[PDB]
């Protein structure tokens, strides 16, 4: 993450991020809505950060320091470039929506009134098809990536020293290789929980309640499709095992 976005999302809530004199001017219902939208953007910033640790710290570090076969590194980090592209673009749109809503003379005071349209765009058309194909591929390769990691850590000394070295800082405590993989797999099932709670506090404008209801339906359709498209790959699986 970059310092500017980290500071903007350092607080535990929207009500603690904005100035108290700005918070005071809003009704409780607006505050409750903004606290959940803030959590959606904050967790998206953290998810993009998880993807950067996987691409820049682990993947590129292995290619540069271990000179490991590119096919082995790909098995450990399936679809990480495509996932980073999808979520960095989504994060860019969420952060721009917040930035446009800032009051003049402030870098922290804002109210996002129109999130639904952005979520409909993300979870429909080509971007939704790309998310569907990418998570179907990622989640089907998840178990294989973990087994490949566990084999390499146990039999390779330079790989073990690489992992121990790059994961030693305290800021990496929750972000080991296996932890990043499960964090990415679990991300997509967080969206209906966040959107349903934003919707609960978005009845004030009928256009917004309708947009969030459509977005919620699109996210669930995407998840149902991803879930149906998963078939766990296994290194050294035989054709007979597959067709039976």
């Amino acid at each position: 993450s970059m310092e500017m976005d980290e500071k903007d999302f350092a607080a535990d809530s929207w009500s603690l991020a904005v100035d108290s004199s700005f918070l005071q001017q809003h009704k409780k219902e607006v505050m409750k809505q903004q606290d959940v939208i803030y959590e959606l953007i904050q967790t998206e910033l953290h998810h993009v950060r998880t993807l950067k640790i996987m691409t820049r710290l682990f993947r590129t570090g292995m290619l540069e320091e271990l000179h490991l076969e590119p096919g082995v590194v790909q098995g450990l980090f399936p679809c990480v470039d495509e996932l980073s592209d999808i979520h960095t673009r989504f994060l860019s749109q969420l952060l721009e929506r917040r930035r446009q809503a800032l009051c003049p003379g402030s870098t922290r005071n804002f109210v996002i009134h129109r999130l639904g349209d952005l979520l409909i765009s993300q979870f429909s058309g080509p971007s939704a098809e790309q998310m569907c194909k990418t998570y179907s591929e990622f989640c089907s390769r998840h178990s294989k990536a973990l087994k490949l990691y566990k084999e390499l850590y146990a039999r390779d000394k330079r790989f073990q020293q690489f992992i121990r070295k790059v994961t030693r800082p305290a800021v990496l405590k929750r972000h080991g290789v296996q932890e990043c993989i499960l964090l990415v797999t679990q991300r997509i099932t967080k969206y209906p929980l966040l959107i349903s709670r934003i919707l609960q506090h978005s009845h004030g404008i009928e256009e917004e309640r309708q947009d969030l209801t459509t977005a919620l339906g699109l996210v669930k359709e995407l998840l149902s499709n991803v879930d149906e498209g998963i078939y766990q790959l296994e290194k050294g699986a035989r054709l007979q095992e597959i067709y039976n």
Partner: protein
């Protein structure tokens, strides 16, 4: 310190997310209770042993039968949750959650946890349940279910007041060490 992995399972209204949030922050949030929990690695010292306990939630995965099992690899202890204000969440324990966890996590200790124990003596809760010929889950009903499903043990807690929360995670760490 040895690394252990804990996963919490249970129905959508069982309070598993709130339980993980309260333990990881050591507080019931006074300003905003998060909707979701990413992960956390707790430094725990139990009975003289230091453990790094990685915590994971299955919330949001309840309707997705092929995504949900991806949370299970290398799990060391399962917390199987139900809500005491929801006798229906207890009934789904033996024939939905238990066969699933025994299949993907053979030989992993399961601790059956009754959440929201504060609601057992809450007037509104008792009134609403009485309209459907029901009452809050009794301590013996929780123990009997835990005994029936082959659970390592039975425990109760309240994420709202923090009572029993520390004990659940310390016992989970001991179960993961066995």
């Amino acid at each position: 310190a040895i690394r252990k992995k804990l996963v919490i399972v249970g129905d959508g209204a069982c309070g598993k997310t709130c339980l993980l949030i309260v333990f990881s922050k050591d507080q019931f949030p006074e300003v905003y209770v998060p909707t979701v929990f990413e992960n956390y690695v707790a430094d725990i010292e139990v009975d003289g042993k230091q453990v790094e306990l990685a915590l994971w939630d299955t919330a949001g995965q309840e309707d997705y039968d092929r995504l949900r099992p991806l949370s299970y690899p290398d799990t060391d202890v399962i917390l199987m949750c139900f809500s005491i204000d929801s006798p229906d969440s207890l009934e789904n324990i033996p024939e939905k959650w238990t066969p699933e966890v025994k299949h993907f996590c053979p030989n992993v200790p399961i601790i059956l946890v009754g959440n929201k124990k504060d609601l057992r003596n809450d007037e509104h809760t008792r009134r609403e349940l009485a309209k459907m010929k029901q009452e809050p889950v009794k301590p013996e009903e929780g123990r009997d279910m835990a005994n029936r499903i082959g659970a390592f043990g039975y425990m109760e807690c309240s994420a709202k007041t923090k009572d029993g929360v520390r004990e659940v995670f310390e016992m989970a760490t001991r179960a993961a060490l066995q």
